[PDB]
Ligand binder design. Structure first.
Ligand SMILES: *Cc1c(COP(=O)(O)O)cnc(C)c1O
Ligand SMILES: *Cc1c(COP(=O)(O)O)cnc(C)c1O
Lengths: 385, 385
């Protein structure tokens, strides 16, 4: 009858949070509109009003993806969860799957691919390598895979991958194209339909400035074919597209309960799509281009060296800087946080220990924050060791 | 170069939401403290401050679960996603899995079990059936399963399942116990450790009144054994416990990035655990008992008949009422919403069409809302057909 665990003393103090300027690869600081909807009251997860908001979010994804794919919806999970949803519904165990292992994203896409039992083919490329359209038409012709995965914005390495024709290509091989646009969406040009991409996904907490935990996905009719006619059943119920599609209104059938959508995160995601819709994709693209170029200038002035040699290959949203020799990078990062309240990051996966990563995302890709991060990284450079 | 999709006109209007009194099985209305943290700014998903909040959330789960299991953490997904996480790490394909199919929850637990390739054994019981400790010791002895699943609070049917000894039992069969306490946690007594439960999970949007999209989970050392020594790799990367455990600080090794936790939802979940810690589990349990009894009284007065005959079996958090003959239930539900701005629900799964469901959850389990829902359901009863 007696209680083993007593109420935690930490929980009896008020929730307090530090004020940080988040200039790493994400998540990023939230604009006022997005904090506001986050503080909103609940409505029924199946009210007609919730359905209306969901439908608006749908159009929002279609606008930012540039597509009319009826099979377009939010995944109730982080970026990873959309990637996993893409793979777990598309790949039968047995299917052949070709992955551009450019950075950690291609690796994760492999790890998942393996886990769901697939003939995965690692086109390994060193941290910084953007796959050649020449390397691709060889790789896929060679392995005749049902699916290719490619990272658009490689936030692990800072690479901006060209996408043109790969869609036209893959289609000729009866191959569907899967693109990770989590870091790239909103920050650089992308056209799901015109570039004939089959599965595009992005995440909430990058250029869109919504809080992390939701993600975005769209399937071309070809993918819709393959998924609705697979013999095997996806190893996941949570991520089962047939269920998700229906509840999200992509069917002929009335919405059936599947799982409880994250209502409040949807309010905030909605707003983030409203915001970029008001700005406009091209205006937003330009801002990210302009901010990144500015940031590049200042870093080079500091004596710092950009990690990606060719500028046309540089991801505007996440800039990667080689590590200043004679410096323990961790100090640099710590000094920025410790003295300026600013978050920047280091390497991830392949790029671990080899780079610093600086993000410029949505309402935060500004000349000012470029100034703040430069003036912070200058000071770091002065007294780090 | 030209843009197919134009910015959606719906997104160019401000986000507006109706004011609803949510008295169904969840999600429920949010208290002020929980709306406030929801409107908070972002911090680094890997800042020491985020780690501190996560650790406080951990204690919070340990307190509300009544456990010291080191393997205790939040799942970045709805209730379903915790259930799926439990199953996908515990069950090897081949393993024998025994499920109390009392309501839709047992069914979902089957569907998943099948999907991950398991020897699932459906102890079907009609909508309302609480498994007999007698039916259990037979079923599990018979099938020698590695895992049993049982719904604690059956929100599909309104049944409150007894749990005592099943833990002691299952252990004697070298069987791990898995309990769904999503609807029951905070609202009725439950003691993970004292009742020797092996895997307990709950969800954020029921009695805790946090927004939907996160969930809670804990593994006993026995489960921790089985999971860290399975030969096969879980069909999911997102839900892989080895990765999740590490990032959540349950390891000897420093936290490695896995996926981006939903920072803002964590703020809100934290607060919801702070709130129940201040109230206290027994005080909260009593409130739900008192409110439910009150609600029961009023429903019976209306001529309405409680769906679960024996009162000791009634889930305090979700009350189920048989459908008044001569009434199309959908009208009743609609009339409540249309005239009173109140949400109540109907059947789900097995109980579809056969019942109405009324939820009493956390700060919302109050005599007042019992009054409001009674006075709304009286009026409905007057002029429904
Ligand atoms: C941030 C990011 C993701 C999202 O990962 P989560 O942590 O799961 O949200 C996915 N892909 C890329 C390329 C990213 O930069
Ligand atoms: C509400 C509830 C859940 C949660 O389901 P999600 O919609 O995935 O959050 C799980 N189990 C039971 C018994 C519930 O009442």
């Amino acid at each position: 009858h007696k209680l083993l665990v007593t109420p935690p003393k930490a929980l009896l103090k008020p929730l307090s949070i530090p004020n940080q300027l988040l200039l790493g690869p994400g998540p990023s600081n939230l604009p006022p509109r997005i904090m506001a909807a986050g503080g909103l009251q609940m409505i029924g997860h199946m009210s007609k009003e919730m359905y209306q908001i969901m439908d608006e979010i749908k159009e929002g994804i279609q606008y930012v993806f540039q597509t009319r794919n009826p099979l377009t919806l939010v995944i109730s999970g982080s970026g990873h969860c959309a990637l996993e949803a893409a793979l777990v519904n598309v790949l039968e165990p047995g299917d052949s799957f070709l992955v551009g292992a450019n950075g950690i994203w291609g690796q994760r896409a492999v790890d998942i691919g393996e886990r769901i039992g697939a003939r995965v083919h690692p086109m390994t490329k060193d941290p910084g390598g953007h796959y050649t359209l020449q390397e691709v038409e060889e790789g896929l012709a060679q392995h005749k895979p049902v699916l290719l995965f490619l990272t658009h914005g490689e936030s692990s390495t800072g690479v901006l991958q060209p996408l043109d024709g790969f869609g036209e290509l893959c289609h000729r091989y009866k191959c569907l194209l899967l693109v990770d646009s989590v870091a790239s969406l909103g920050g650089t040009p992308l056209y799901m339909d015109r570039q004939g991409i089959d599965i595009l996904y992005s995440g909430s907490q990058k250029a869109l400035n919504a809080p992390p935990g939701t993600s975005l996905i769209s399937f071309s009719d070809k993918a819709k074919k393959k998924m609705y006619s697979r013999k095997t059943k996806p190893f996941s119920f949570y991520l089962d597209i047939k269920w998700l599609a229906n509840f999200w209104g992509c069917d002929d059938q009335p919405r059936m309960y599947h799982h409880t959508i994250p209502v409040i995160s949807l309010y905030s995601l909605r707003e983030s799509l409203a915001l970029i819709a008001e700005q406009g994709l091209e205006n937003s693209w330009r801002q990210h281009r302009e901010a990144a170029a500015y940031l590049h200038g200042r870093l080079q002035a500091l004596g710092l060296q950009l990690f990606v040699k060719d500028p046309a290959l540089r991801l505007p949203t996440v800039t990667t800087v080689a590590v200043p020799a004679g410096y323990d990078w961790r100090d640099i990062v710590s000094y920025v946080m410790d003295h300026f309240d600013i978050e920047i990051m280091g390497g991830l996966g392949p790029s671990t220990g080899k780079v610093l990563r600086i993000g410029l995302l949505g309402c935060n890709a500004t000349r000012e924050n470029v100034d703040r991060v430069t003036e912070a990284l200058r000071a770091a450079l002065q007294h780090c060791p």
